[PDB]
């Protein structure tokens, strides 16, 4: 890992995988559970009203 | 693939329900993810396993 | 230890300054720390080694 400036490829890909997982954690919580819970209700209510 | 292949109005009702849920929740997820990423923007320190 | 051992007034001004800056960032720090804690608020999954 010591030649970070000599291996831009490996390093940039490391930063990409990290930012991916930590942003993903939030993502699943904030957004995915939000779907699984708001979707069926919204589906039923708009179907019924429609 | 569901039984709503026909009935395109009901189908459009279900699709638009999904879309309106995701589009209502879109902001908080984005901005939330940037704020949780604030520490990793300053020092994305890389471990030898990473 | 500093050169302001004498001069109790200027020392208290230096301290109080420090006090107000920290108090100025305290709220932002707290709210941001909450938001980063939102995925753990729902499901703080515990691995075995933890």
UniProtKB/Swiss-Prot annotation, chains B, C:
Report which superkingdom the organism of origin falls in.
Eukaryota
Q: Localized where? A: Mitochondrion intermembrane space
Q: Give a short account of what the protein does.
A: Constitutes the soluble short form (S-MGM1) generated by cleavage by PCP1, which plays a central role in mitochondrial inner membrane fusion and cristae morphology. The transmembrane long form (L-MGM1) and the S-MGM1 form higher-order helical assemblies that coordinate the fusion of mitochondrial inner membranes. Inner membrane-anchored L-MGM1 molecules initiate membrane remodeling by recruiting soluble S-MGM1 to rapidly polymerize into a flexible cylindrical scaffold encaging the mitochondrial inner membrane.
Q: Specify the protein name.
A: Dynamin-like GTPase MGM1, small form
Species classification: Eukaryota, Fungi, Dikarya, Ascomycota, Pezizomycotina
């Amino acid at each position: 890992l010591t030649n970070k400036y000599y291996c831009p490829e490996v390093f940039l890909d490391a930063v990409a995988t990290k930012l991916a997982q930590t942003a993903v954690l939030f993502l699943n919580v904030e957004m995915l559970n939000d779907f699984y819970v708001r979707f069926p209700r919204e589906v039923e209510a708009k179907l019924h009203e429609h | 693939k569901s039984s709503f292949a026909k009935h395109p109005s009901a189908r459009k009702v279900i699709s638009d329900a999904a879309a309106t849920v995701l589009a209502d929740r879109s902001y908080a997820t984005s901005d939330g993810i940037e704020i949780s990423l604030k520490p990793y923007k300053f020092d994305p320190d890389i471990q030898p396993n990473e």
